[PDB]
Amino acid sequence: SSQIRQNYSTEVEAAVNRLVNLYLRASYTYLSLGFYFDRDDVALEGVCHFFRELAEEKREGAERLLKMQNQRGGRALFQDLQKPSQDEWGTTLDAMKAAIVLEKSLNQALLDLHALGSAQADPHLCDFLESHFLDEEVKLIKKMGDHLTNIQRLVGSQAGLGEYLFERLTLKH
Amino acid sequence: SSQIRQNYSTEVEAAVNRLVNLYLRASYTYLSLGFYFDRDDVALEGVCHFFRELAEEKREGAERLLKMQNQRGGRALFQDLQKPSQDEWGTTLDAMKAAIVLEKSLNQALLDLHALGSAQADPHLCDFLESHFLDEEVKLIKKMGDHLTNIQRLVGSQAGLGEYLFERLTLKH
Amino acid sequence: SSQIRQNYSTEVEAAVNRLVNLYLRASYTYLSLGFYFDRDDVALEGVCHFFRELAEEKREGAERLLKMQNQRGGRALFQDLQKPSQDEWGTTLDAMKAAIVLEKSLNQALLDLHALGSAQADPHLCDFLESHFLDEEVKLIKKMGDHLTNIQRLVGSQAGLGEYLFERLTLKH
Amino acid sequence: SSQIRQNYSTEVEAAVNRLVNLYLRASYTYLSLGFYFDRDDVALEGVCHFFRELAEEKREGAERLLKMQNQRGGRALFQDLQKPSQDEWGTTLDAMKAAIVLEKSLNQALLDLHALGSAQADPHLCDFLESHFLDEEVKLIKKMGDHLTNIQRLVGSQAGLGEYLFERLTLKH
Numbered sequence A, B, C, D: 001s002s003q004i005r006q007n008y009s010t011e012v013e014a015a016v017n018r019l020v021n022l023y024l025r026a027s028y029t030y031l032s033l034g035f036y037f038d039r040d041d042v043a044l045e046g047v048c049h050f051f052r053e054l055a056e057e058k059r060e061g062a063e064r065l066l067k068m069q070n071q072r073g074g075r076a077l078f079q080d081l082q083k084p085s086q087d088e089w090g091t092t093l094d095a096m097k098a099a100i101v102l103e104k105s106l107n108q109a110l111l112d113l114h115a116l117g118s119a120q121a122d123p124h125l126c127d128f129l130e131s132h133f134l135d136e137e138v139k140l141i142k143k144m145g146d147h148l149t150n151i152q153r154l155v156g157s158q159a160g161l162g163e164y165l166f167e168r169l170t171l172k173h
Ligand SMILES: [Au+]
Pocket: A114, A117, A118, A123, A126
């Protein structure tokens, strides 16, 4: 074991590596979501940009986890990254629903890792998650819920119109 | 009685304290309106900001009344503040209707206080209301009436769409 | 329940609403304290400003709690706001003693809410309180204790003089 | 009568001339107060400056009244100006008490003139007083009441000390 490793359980080390895998999986999902909305037959630029920005954010979360793994003396271990759950993502509504599902799973993984840290008496892990992840996730899930509400209200009887208007007047382009 | 008190009736002093209570009540109503429109399942940011800004304005009106009470040698007396009339505020249309009702009640209270001042020959009170409150209220009620008209025109057959469009293109975000 | 709500107990949701009520109550107390020290027959400008600034700070705490309630998918519920415990606040010493009592009650409410969060395994709630409230309160209570000490030392045999000097040379005007 | 005079009673015209006399009398009182506090055996610079600034303010009030008299087509008529009520003004407390008495008499004269204007249906006179005099007077009398309170609290058992401290730490020099 590391010359620097102190109070860092094998259990947390392994759960960190698994979380890295989740975040990179999530990043890959968002890359696929982003490019789907760039297809000439979908063509919702603001939706594409919203998902591409999330791909970067999730990559950044993984890189923060990997940096922390090294700072504690754990050993990064990478696994295969499973492709995203879908090749085509339907409407903006369908996509935002899938994104909120994905975020809830990340959030629950964070909470599970926090509980493990608390059981292992690892306050540096708890702090790290509280400072860099738990609020970021709460804020993002709230944003998504606000978006889902506005998208749903816009469906009405003219779905196409509502999807265009949401892209143009809420999402950034 | 105060070493400074001059031409300031007990009646006006008491009516000032009651008006302070009304303004603070109104402020609290607007705080509740503002946060309702911030719920993930309402999510009309511009509507939230319109009501939150009014919460501040009504607080400011109360503070101006309290400052004036002290300048005339009256004694501020605070009472309990009743909660707002509703916990949920319905649509933007429902909310704007409730706001205009509330403003009309404030306006009538101002006018009643002006009439009392006139009956008591208290020109400083009359001036104070004319200068800091009566036009502010007339302008606000007109703005609200303009908003109600535009919201109502937007309901048509596609209410959800109309509510989104009003938030996006009239209200500020 | 919310589409966004995750790991957020009904118990915490309700305790958050109660804390909002406490903070708004505290804000109202400070508004009354502030205006009392603005009376022509009290006239301690720096004491008035100290309490008015606290009224704003406590309002801000309530608004942060309400924002957080919405971000977690809870539902803000407002109750009646009880008036402050006194109509007249005595000397600067009396007022600062009442303020420290009030702050200790807020602090204890925060700690009680933190313990509930810990019992419910809600690390986002714990973080939120630790980051935005617990140190703010500790720092404020320390400031108050420092003020009480200086005010008490100034009473001596010339109370009036001491109260003037504290207002002029410690409090800001 | 003037080619311009319209709705301007002889009664208001005469009461305006009398008010001019009062304001100039008040100005002269403040000049005497100011120079008394400049005596080598009084030597309270900040008290001198407070009263000298008021001498100017009251002169300015008279000049505004005279300008208004001309704008309405009335004819300024000057009378003898009686000297101030005292040659020596005692302590800062004595002086501030005399000043508040003087201001109350000016205020009552303003209110009496407003009532006359109202009885004569002269809204321009009412406006003029409301806009340029009634609030200025209320604010000044409040300032004076605040000063009297602080001076009185400072007397205690060490009057000399209290008078020095009030001059140094409240009044400007
Ligand atoms: Au923990």
